[PDB]
Design a protein around this ligand. Structure first.
Ligand SMILES: Nc1ncnc2c1ncn2[C@@H]1O[C@H](COS(=O)(=O)NC(=O)[C@@H]2CCN2)[C@@H](O)[C@H]1O
Ligand SMILES: Nc1ncnc2c1ncn2[C@@H]1O[C@H](COS(=O)(=O)NC(=O)[C@@H]2CCN2)[C@@H](O)[C@H]1O
Ligand SMILES: [Zn+2]
Ligand SMILES: [Zn+2]
Lengths: 476, 476
C-alpha cells in the first residue's frame, strides 16, 4: 500500500502502527514489547540528546557509565515484578542471579558512598545515556510503553536540601524545553501525588503531555527529590562542617527522560497523511525533489545548487535525485516521513527562476524566487515550528478545564478531556475516582500543577477539605 | 596513599589497578568482570565516539538502535557459552528464555531480510553505539577483558563482494586512525588466521597493538567480511539485475571497536607517576594551578585570564582554583590523572610576565612569556601527541622481529617480543606452537600482516611449505 489506511480519529492504534512503520521509524521484533529504532527514529533521539547533553554540561553535570547488572544485595538495600533476572550463562547456571537495571539508584549509590568523605566532595552531578529494562506485562506500545528503552538518567547528591531543590526545577524546565522548543509539544508542569510518586523519593515533579486523539494524558519526564531516603539506605554521609561531631546525610536527586518523547511527538503532530516532524528536530528539514537528457541534468544541477545553498545557512537538507523513483512516489514518500518542506523544482519553474515550497503541516504550496530561496525557507521552517506548537498548545487549553463536583467531572472526562479538580491528596480518595470513572480506563491523578487554572473548598470525595487543585484524567 | 606504590616494570597488575583508580577513571563493582566508568574514563570514550561517529557519516553510514534481547530462534539460525540468559522477570518465570546480545548479527539481519526486495534497497549501512555482554569466565581486566562493555558495531550489506571488500579496509583504517592519531598507539594491520577469525565470517581483518610491559599483544579492533554466510542463514536476497531469473545473496560486513581502547592507552602510555593522556583525547588538555588576600586574588585573576585565553584557541582547559587543596596536592593530583600540561603561575612569575608549563610525558618545565602563552602551548600539545606516538612506535619496531626456525622463535618470545614467522596457515600447526611455547601463557597467532617485515620457504612446523609471514606472540 502506498500510504496510510486508517484515519487518526477512526482507529488510533492502526493509525499509530502504520505511521511509525511507513515513515521508516520503527521495525517490529520477535520479542514482545521490544522495537527496533531505525535511523529516522534514532535521528530524533540524537537531536534530543545533543540539546539536553549540552545543557546539563552548563549546569556542571558530567557523563559516565555504570554497569547494567545489579546484585541482589544492592536491590534489597532499598527493598521488583518488572525486573529482568539473568540466571545462567550458556548451559551453566550462575551461582547467584543477577538483575538487569530498571533504574540505576542501587547501582550508583554504593559508589557514591565511597566517594563522599567530607562536604568538599559534594556536589556530585552525574548523568548516563543508556538502556534499561522494565518487564511490564501490559500491552506495550512503540515508544510510549516499551519493555526496553533508551534514556538518560541523572543522579545528583548535595550537602543541603535547598541546592537539591533548585536542580529539580532546573532539570524539569529543561524537559519542558525539550518538549516545547524541540518537539513543539505543550506540557503541564506539576508535582505527582503521594500515590504516583517515585518509590523511595521525597517528591516527584513531572511534565504531563496530552494526546488529544485518545483524550489521554502521558507522563513526559520526571525529576525527583529523593531527599535523604537513598543516602540513608546506602550510608552516603559526610562530616557536618557547622556541627563539630554530628554526621549529615547527602540530599539527592534523580531525573530521567526516555524515547517515549518520540512517541508523543508522533501522536500529537501526526496527521492522516503520515508523520510530521518539527523542524528543530527533523534530521532532514528540507527535501529537494526533481519535478531530454540535457534538460534532466540541468534539473539535477538546479537541485544541487539549492542543496548546497541551504547547507550554507546550516539548514539540514537532502536532494532525492534517485531516477528509479518517480516524482509522485517521492512526494508521498517524504510526506509519510514528515519532512517539513518539500522543495519542488520542475523544468518550467527552473526557467522562471523560482520553485514550489510545500509545507508539511498545512500543505501550502508557496512559490519562492531563486534569489529569495534561503531567506524565505528558514522563515518557513520557523513558522512551521511555531504553527505546530501553537496548534497543540491551544488543543491542550481547550481539552483542560476545571470541575468542582464528581458529577461534572465525570461528563467532562467522557467528552475526552482532562480536568483539574479540588483534591485532598489522600490515596483512598484517588482509588475511588479511578473506580467510579471506570464503571461510568479509569481516571488517574496526572499532576498537581504549579500554575493551576483556578484557586481554592471541599474535596471531590466529600469527606475532608481540599488541599490543592489536581489534574486528573485517563492516562497511558 | 598520595600516589602510586607499584612500579610498571615491577608489578603490572597492581600498577594497572592503582593507575585506573587513582586517576579517577575506574570504580569496582560487586559483580565480577563489570567496572564503573567514571567521567575521566568516559570522556575519552566520548572523544573516540565523536571522531569515529563523524567519520562513518561521511561514508554514508547511519546510526540506529536494535533491541538488546535476542530470541533463541534467532540465535540458532546461525548455530554460546558466553551468552547471558534471562529466564525470569521478578518472581514469575518466563515461558521461553531470552538472551543478552554478545553481538547483534542475529538481532539485525532478520530485519535486513525484510528491508531487501531489490538491489536498489542496497547498500544498507547501519551502526549503533551500545552495550554488549560476553560472560567470559577467565580473569577479567578493566577495559581490556570486561564482562560488559560499551562499543560500536557497524553492519553493512552490499550487492557485490567488491563493494564490501573496500569498506572492510576503509573501516580498518579508521580504527588504525583512532589508535594512532587519537590515542597515539601504534598498530599492526593484518588478517586473522583461520583459527582466530570471526565465527561465520569469510575473513577477519584486525589491528594488533603491543603492550611492552607485559610483552603481550592485544586485538585492538576488527573489521569482518561476512561474505554471503549470514545472508544465507537469514535469507537476505535480491533480484539479480544482470541475470533475469536467478537470485543473489547480499555480501555483508560487520565491524566493532570497544572500550578496550582506553585500557591499551593506559597500558602503553602510562608511567610510574600515573596516567598519561594524549592531548587529542584528553578532556582537560591544560590544567591551571595557582602557585596577602589581594595578592591571592590577583593570582586567581591571572589564572582566569590564561583560562579564557586558551578557550579562545579551542584548547580544553580547566582552572583548579580550589583553596582547600595546596599547590603540592594539585600537582600530584593532576599528575596522576595525566593532564598533558600543568600551567603553573606563582607570585614571582606573575610579576615577571611569565609562567611555568610542565609537560606530562617528559616532565620538562618550560618558562613561557605571557604574550607567547597561547601559541607555544598548542605547539607543546602537538609535540606531546607526537612524542607519545613516536616513543610507542619505536617501542613496537624494537619488540617486533623476524624468526625462521622454532628454536630462534622460542628465545625471541622469551625476551618479551612478538615475532613474525613463516607459517602455512593450518590450525593443527597453530595449536602446536601454543603447546610448545607454553611448556618452554602460550603464543598465539596475532595477525597475517599486510606489510610484513620480510618476504618468503618451509613452515615453522616443518611439514609443508609456508604460505605467508604471520605475526605470533603472547596475547591478552
Ligand atoms: N516502559 C516505558 N517505556 C518508555 N518510557 C518509560 C517507560 N516507563 C517509564 N518511562 C518514562 O521514563 C521516565 C523516567 O522514569 S521514572 O520512573 O519516572 N524515573 C526514574 O526511573 C528515575 C530516573 C532514575 N530513576 C518517566 O517519566 C516515563 O515517561
Ligand atoms: N570482553 C571484551 N572486553 C572488551 N573488549 C572486547 C572484549 N571481547 C572482545 N572485545 C573487543 O571487541 C572487538 C570486536 O569484537 S569482535 O568479536 O571481534 N567482532 C564482533 O563482535 C563483530 C562486530 C559485530 N560483530 C574486538 O576486536 C575486541 O578488541
Ligand atoms: Zn478527599
Ligand atoms: Zn605447517
Amino acid at each position: 500500500r502506498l500510504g496510510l489506511e486508517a484515519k487518526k480519529e477512526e482507529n488510533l492504534a492502526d493509525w499509530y502502527s502504520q505511521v511509525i512503520t511507513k515513515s521508516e521509524m520503527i521495525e517490529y521484533h520477535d520479542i514482545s514489547g521490544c522495537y527496533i529504532l531505525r535511523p529516522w527514529a534514532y535521528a530524533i533521539w540524537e537531536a534530543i540528546k545533543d540539546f539536553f547533553d549540552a545543557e546539563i554540561k552548563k549546569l556542571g553535570v558530567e557523563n559516565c557509565y555504570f554497569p547494567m547488572f545489579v546484585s541482589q544485595s544492592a536491590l534489597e538495600k532499598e527493598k521488583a515484578p518488572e525486573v529482568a533476572w539473568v540466571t545462567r550463562s550458556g548451559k551453566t547456571e550462575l551461582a547467584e542471579p543477577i538483575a538487569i537495571r530498571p533504574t540505576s539508584e542501587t547501582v550508583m549509590y554504593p559508589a557514591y558512598a565511597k566517594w563522599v568523605q567530607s562536604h568538599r566532595d559534594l556536589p556530585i552531578k552525574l548523568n548516563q545515556w543508556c538502556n534499561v529494562v522494565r518487564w511490564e506485562f501490559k500491552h506495550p506500545q512503540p515508544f510510549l510503553r516499551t519493555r526496553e528503552f533508551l534514556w538518560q538518567e541523572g543522579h545528583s547528591a548535595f550537602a543541603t536540601m535547598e541546592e537539591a531543590a533548585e536542580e529539580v526545577l532546573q532539570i524539569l524546565d529543561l524537559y519542558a524545553q525539550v518538549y516545547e522548543e524541540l518537539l513543539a509539544i505543550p506540557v503541564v508542569k506539576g508535582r505527582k501525588t503521594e500515590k504516583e510518586k517515585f518509590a523511595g523519593g521525597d517528591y516527584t515533579t513531572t511534565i504531563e503531555a496530552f494526546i488529544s486523539a485518545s483524550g489521554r494524558a502521558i507522563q513526559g519526564g520526571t525529576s525527583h527529590h529523593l531527599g535523604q531516603n537513598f543516602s540513608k539506605m546506602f550510608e552516603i554521609v559526610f562530616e557536618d562542617p557547622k556541627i563539630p561531631g554530628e554526621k549529615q546525610f547527602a540530599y539527592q536527586n534523580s531525573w530521567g527522560l526516555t524515547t517515549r518523547t518520540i512517541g508523543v511527538m508522533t501522536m500529537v503532530h501526526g496527521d492522516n497523511m503520515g508523520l510530521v516532524l518539527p523542524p528543530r528536530v527533523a534530521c532532514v528539514q528540507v527535501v529537494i525533489i526533481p519535478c531530454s537528457e540535457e534538460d534532466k541534468e540541468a534539473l539535477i544541477a538546479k537541485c544541487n545548487d539549492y542543496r548546497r545553498r541551504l547547507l550554507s545557512v546550516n539548514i539540514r537538507v537532502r536532494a532525492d535525485l534517485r531516477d528509479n523513483y518517480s516524482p509522485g512516489w517521492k512526494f508521498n514518500h517524504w510526506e509519510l516521513k514528515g519532512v517539513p518542506i518539500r522543495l519542488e523544482v520542475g523544468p518550467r519553474d527552473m526557467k522562471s527562476c523560482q520553485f514550489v515550497a510545500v509545507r508539511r503541516d498545512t500543505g501550502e504550496k508557496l512559490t519562492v524566487a531563486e534569489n529569495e530561496a534561503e531567506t524565505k525557507l528558514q522563515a518557513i521552517l520557523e513558522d512551521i515550528q511555531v504553527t505546530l506548537f501553537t496548534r497543540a498548545s491551544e488543543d491542550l487549553k481547550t481539552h483542560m478545564v476545571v470541575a468542582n463536583t464528581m458529577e461534572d467531572f465525570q461528563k467532562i472526562l467522557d467528552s475526552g478531556k482532562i480536568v483539574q479538580i479540588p483534591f485532598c491528596g489522600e490515596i483512598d480518595c484517588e482509588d475511588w475516582i479511578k473506580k467510579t470513572t471506570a464503571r461510568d480506563m479509569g481516571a488517574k491523578s496526572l499532576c498537581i500543577p504549579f500554575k493551576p487554572l483556578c484557586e481554592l473548598a471541599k474535596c471531590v470525595c466529600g469527606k475532608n477539605p481540599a488541599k490543592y487543585y489536581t489534574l486528573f484524567g485517563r492516562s497511558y
